[PDB]
């Protein structure tokens, strides 16, 4: 929810990244595992 997204100073690119994130929960678990560990 725009939290795991980088802060880089293309709105369609942002929502299309979020759509792939929510469509694959395994991608969420691997992305969360990087910063939590």
């Amino acid at each position: 929810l725009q939290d795991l997204l980088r802060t880089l100073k293309s709105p369609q690119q942002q929502q299309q990244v979020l759509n792939i994130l929510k469509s694959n929960p395994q991608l969420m678990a691997a992305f969360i595992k990087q910063r939590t560990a």
Partner: protein, 194 residues
Amino acid sequence: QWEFEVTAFYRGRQVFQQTLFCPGGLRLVGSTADMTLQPVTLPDPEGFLTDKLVKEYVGQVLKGLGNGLALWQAGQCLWAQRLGHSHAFWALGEELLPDSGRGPDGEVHKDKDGAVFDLRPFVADLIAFMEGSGHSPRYTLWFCMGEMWPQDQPWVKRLVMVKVVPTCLKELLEMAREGGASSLKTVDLHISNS
């Protein structure tokens, strides 16, 4: 639909690069234009090259595009079809170098069954990349227009090479590298006093 970064190379020279969002589909045509419903016109080789024989053959390849090469997304997959007389071969690679050691991943179909990219292998490779596999999933689509795929020969000698990069997939890999995942698994640093 996905936002694409399109880049075209004429005989190893970057002659076009734009980042456009076409919800009605992509179309890579030449000077012989035609409106059908979004077209992306490739530049004329006159204002970019000086080799007369190369400019004549690039124009012949741009003529063979006809109504151009179409590209779109459907069901977590990218599909590419050609609507002209020139054949087209595609493969995945890096942003600054197509893979010339191996052949192409296939020839661009003449019907609606393109299937040049699937999101499912990209996610599976990206998860392993973050788990520590050291192999980042490739996302750069290369198209060789009007010629065979440059196998065992420099890709800069091909007349028309088009690079298509989905911007959403590019950022999804940058988020993995920003999170600690790396691909640098081999390096022999030649540094010393002597």
